[PDB]
Amino acid sequence: IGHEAKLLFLKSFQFILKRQIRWLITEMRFPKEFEHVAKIIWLKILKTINDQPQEELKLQLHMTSTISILYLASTHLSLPVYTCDYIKWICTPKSWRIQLPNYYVSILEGSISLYNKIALTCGMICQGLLLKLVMQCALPPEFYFYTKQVIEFEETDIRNSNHAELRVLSYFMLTINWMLMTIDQKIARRKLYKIFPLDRTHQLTFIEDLQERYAKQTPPARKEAIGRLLTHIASQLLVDFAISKEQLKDCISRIKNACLHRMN
Amino acid sequence: EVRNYRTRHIVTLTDLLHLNVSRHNWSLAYKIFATLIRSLWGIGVEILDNLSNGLDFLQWMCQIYSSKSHTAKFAITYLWSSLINCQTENDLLQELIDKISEWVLAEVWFIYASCHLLKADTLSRQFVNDNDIKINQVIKHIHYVRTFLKICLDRLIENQLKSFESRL
């Protein structure tokens, strides 16, 4: 790792992150076919950024670029997955060069799989949603069919920035809105002793502990009710997607206006 | 800004630990504290005493770190636990107390003086009992009382000692 050499080390670290894709996917039982597709995409983009003649390298929410490629891979293959779904996966040897690497570059390369950024980067480069949204909605199917019809009409009618996922998510909202055992201190002591001595990270264990704590207590009338339910849904949707309110409400308003114009 | 998973997890764990201390969660403290390890440790010291499963060890380790260098907050506590716990061989503790005082010249000396007093009380009743002997223990007790008197000097307490000697 050096000027040129630093750039090379950063690229090697990013390739190792692709390994994370290998590890996550295999743990999955998806299509090994998957590896094949993932391998083509990495070759197209990375080489090109490199291709524009030894000027400037590149930087990214490095974690998000790999995720976008993984997400992109799924879009072609027709796996049913969503950006929000990808976020859930993220929650739950190494070359020296990596140790010896530009500070900034090393930080960018980082680890681990603002609301606006994840959605924006992917953009720059129906059946699937049905199950999840229905479940959140809790509708047996009547809701599903109508939303399906509405969205199709809206496309045809073309009321309709934001990605189709955003539009579709928005329109669902509109339609539904109006439906007419323990180590103990011992471990601490040992750690302290080792630090006295030269010593040289996150693990699941953490996840399990959190889950256990949560389980153990750890963590106009009709019209009015309908409105409240719908609102709950908006808030909760944002959180689950691992996306914001400012970016959802605006999109929904725009879609509704377009639909009204088309109908009129 | 805030870390993705790591910063938020730590803050939430700390909040949960506070909730556990508010409500005793011997189990919650054990797992919550372990998760939290990833200064301070009073709650950890508190959980061991509050929920047992012999709470003396962790305090000693905490007292041992960061020694080189009002007075020290870790420590003046560790000393109190000892006498109360005693209430193994004590002489040893008294020896340790002296050592600490030597190194560092609320004064610890007062605590040391109090510790001997406890031994004198035990000596006082054992000596009072017939099972009938004239010198030995009585002289030893008198010496101990004088030693205790010297430390305090450099009303209620003094009165108590006197009563004690008389009974012996």
């Binding site: 929650c91 996840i207 959190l210 949560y214 963590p219 914001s244 | -």
Partner: peptide
């Protein structure tokens, strides 16, 4: 905060 929320959601899901 968002991250925390996400984590919580995940936990809930796991519990379910």
């Amino acid at each position: 905060a968002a991250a925390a929320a996400a984590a919580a959601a995940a936990a809930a899901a796991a519990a379910a």
